[PDB]
Amino acid sequence: DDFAKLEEQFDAKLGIFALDTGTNRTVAYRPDERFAFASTIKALTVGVLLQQKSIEDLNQRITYTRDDLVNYNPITEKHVDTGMTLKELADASLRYSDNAAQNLILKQIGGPESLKKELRKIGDEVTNPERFCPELNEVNPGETQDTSTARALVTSLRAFALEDKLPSEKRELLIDWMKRNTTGDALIRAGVPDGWEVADKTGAASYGTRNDIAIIWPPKGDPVVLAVLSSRDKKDAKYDDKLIAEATKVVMKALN
Numbered sequence: 001d002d003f004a005k006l007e008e009q010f011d012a013k014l015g016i017f018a019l020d021t022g023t024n025r026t027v028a029y030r031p032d033e034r035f036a037f038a039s040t041i042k043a044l045t046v047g048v049l050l051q052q053k054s055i056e057d058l059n060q061r062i063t064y065t066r067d068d069l070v071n072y073n074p075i076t077e078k079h080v081d082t083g084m085t086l087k088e089l090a091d092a093s094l095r096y097s098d099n100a101a102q103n104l105i106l107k108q109i110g111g112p113e114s115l116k117k118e119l120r121k122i123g124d125e126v127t128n129p130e131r132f133c134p135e136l137n138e139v140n141p142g143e144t145q146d147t148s149t150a151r152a153l154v155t156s157l158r159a160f161a162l163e164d165k166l167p168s169e170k171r172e173l174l175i176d177w178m179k180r181n182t183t184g185d186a187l188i189r190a191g192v193p194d195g196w197e198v199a200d201k202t203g204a205a206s207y208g209t210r211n212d213i214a215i216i217w218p219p220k221g222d223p224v225v226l227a228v229l230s231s232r233d234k235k236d237a238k239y240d241d242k243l244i245a246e247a248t249k250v251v252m253k254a255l256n
């Protein structure tokens with residue numbers, strides 16, 4: 001209803017699933033509606049990379065050229081002369097949403113079909129990887145390639161970061177990278193009080209798709225895991241990061 005009102009204000013469709021891991025209390029709004037997952041899939045991709053490698057194996061250096069570079073290469077364009085390690089590539093993918101870094105990591109785990117297989121193996125029957133960066137964002141309404149839902153993304157994000165799809169050292173690396181995300185200050189982070197730690201990964205795609213997935217730690221107690229997904233209407237629609245910030249405030253009010 002506050003969520004209804006936000007849809008009205010931003011002329012958008014919202015998808016919200018949040019779970020308090022301390023109480024199992026939930027806040028749901030279209031929790032099972034599909035949205036292009038966009039770059040949020042970088043978080044699940046690193047999850048799988050970490051599963052498929054020792055911490056030491058992440059030190060393997062990957063070489064590439066301007067030919068492995070795509071539309072958006074913030075860190076990856078600085079190091080084509082020397083290459084980057086897998087650890088450095090996981091850092092750039094998660095924290096700067098480097099599309100090139102994501103594509104090389106995808107290559108290392110075996111491309112979209114193998115990502116899907118590993119996602120099915122951990123219990124995710126909804127998230128549907130099909131394509132590399134950036135083609136995956138171009139989703140028309142009614143298609144299901146490169147989509148997930150807010151319920152699925154929280155369940156999968158929780159499985160890697162918080163439960164037993166990874167051992168503790170690797171969960172620590174995942175959560176460290178995601179706590180130090182640079183792309184998310186005006187989204188979920190802006191809807192949470194200061195002093196509350198947030199680990200997040202953002203996405204943006206056509207149809208004004210604007211997403212954020214996060215783990216949120218209140219000083220007091222167990223983490224909350226949250227997906228805020230949104231889309232419009234128009235293919236060339238703009239989004240407004242404020243809608244995510246405000247949705248996040250409503251979620252925290254409903255659980256506090």
Ligand SMILES: O=C(O)c1cc(N2C(=O)C=CC2=O)ccc1-c1c2ccc(=O)cc-2oc2cc(O)ccc12
Pocket residue numbers: 037038039040041042071072099102132133134135136137138203204205206207208235
């Ligand atoms: O670069 C792009 O193609 C683009 C690529 C991805 N991307 C992923 O999210 C996972 C791999 C990948 O290609 C995600 C979002 C965008 C992106 C947009 C994509 C299509 C278009 O409809 C508008 C986009 O607008 C964006 C805006 C941002 O601020 C930041 C980003 C975007």
